[PDB]
Design a protein around this nucleic acid. Structure first.
Ligand code: NA
Ligand code: NA
Ligand code: NA
Ligand code: NA
Length: 327
DNA sequence: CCGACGGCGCATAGC
DNA sequence: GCTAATGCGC
DNA sequence: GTCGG
């Protein structure tokens, strides 16, 4: 539905969500407000009262009251006040730097560091992740058009294959479901030599190749199974530079790969629905495995999985393509 | 009334 | 020095 | 903040 419907309500709830997470450090209220915003954003009517909204799952008595106040006055008193509170709006703002969470944002604002310029002048106080997040603050808040995702995928798959043609790499996330834009790039990597029961340089060799061709420009964190960093598409003769983008690469054991691909393809809602059905059929599906449940509820050993299809086959579901996995 | 609400890889105080 | 907890992001 | 056992 068009934002013209309940965009004022949804924006208000998301704003309240951020202050719960970033200022109050109340992650479950942050998720409460988000869930309310999501269910409202799906509702195909311009909401007329708090009681109407309360019929939706995730909207309770308090959000109903807030909606009544927003509908009658066009604002929320509590939101206006915290909006103009110098310290709270600064803590909320600083968490938009990757690497700055609620605790670091609080500590910063406590000692007078409230803006990006303040952070710039205080690099001594920033860890490595935070410095990168600052350097790319604007680029990281930009979306990635799908054409650029295809160009990024071209490079990633080419260089992975060049390191060892037995690697398997899949770009997941909404991109794999067909999305016209993406927030980051999520790469799932495996190799036949790497199983649950089997090697500490499998991920490193791929990261190193991507750094040697100057696709990966920065590293946020790197271990033996997860890389989080920054990359940038190459520009040409006299064209403007592409923004820097967030990329993650995870190395998964071959026998857990398609459980990983399924899970990191999503959507979140599809995942829950698929996991709901799997239970109803006697299986438990997590990020790693699919296991049968005994009649006492006791989980058995993980079943062999060799494609996404196998998982659908186990739970008597027709294979669905990623484009039809929105829910 | 009252606890759950996701769990885990990697970076960076307490002994 | 080692170990575990915590912040962080996803 | 909302849900549900
Ligand atoms: Na409700
Ligand atoms: Na942040
Ligand atoms: Na953030
Ligand atoms: Na080869």
């Amino acid at each position: 539905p068009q934002e013209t419907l309940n965009g004022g309500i949804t924006d208000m709830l998301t704003e309240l969500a951020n202050f719960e997470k970033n200022v109050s450090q109340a992650i479950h209220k942050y998720n409460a407000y988000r869930k309310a915003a999501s269910v409202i954003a799906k509702y195909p009517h311009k909401i007329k009262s708090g009681a109407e909204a309360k019929k939706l799952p995730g909207v309770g008595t308090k959000i109903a009251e807030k909606i009544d106040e927003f509908l009658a006055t066009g604002k929320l008193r509590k939101l206006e006040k915290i909006r103009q509170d110098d310290t709270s709006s600064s803590i909320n703002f600083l968490t938009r730097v990757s690497g700055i969470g609620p605790s670091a944002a609080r500590k910063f604002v406590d000692e007078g560091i409230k803006t990006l310029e303040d952070l710039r002048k205080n690099e001594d106080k920033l860890n490595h992740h935070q410095r990168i997040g600052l350097k790319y603050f604007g680029d990281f808040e930009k979306r990635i058009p799908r054409e650029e995702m295809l160009q990024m995928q071209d490079i990633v798959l080419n260089e992975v294959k060049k390191v060892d043609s037995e690697y398997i790499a899949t770009v997941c996330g909404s991109f794999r479901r067909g999305a016209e834009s993406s927030g980051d790039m999520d790469v799932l990597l495996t190799h036949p030599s790497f199983t649950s029961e089997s090697q500490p340089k499998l991920l490193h060799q791929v990261v190193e190749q991507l750094q040697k061709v100057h696709f990966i420009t920065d590293t946020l964190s790197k271990g033996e199974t997860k890389f989080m960093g920054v990359c940038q598409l190459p520009s040409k003769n006299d064209e403007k530079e592409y923004p820097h983008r967030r990329i993650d690469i995870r190395l998964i054991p071959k026998d857990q790969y398609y459980c990983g691909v399924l899970y990191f393809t999503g959507s979140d809602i599809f995942n829950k629905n698929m996991r709901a059905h799997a239970l109803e059929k006697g299986f438990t599906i997590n990020e790693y495995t699919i296991r049968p449940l005994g009649v006492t509820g006791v989980a058995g050993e993980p079943l062999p999985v060799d494609s996404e299809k196998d998982i659908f086959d186990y739970i008597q579901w027709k294979y669905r393509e990623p484009k039809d996995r929105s829910e």
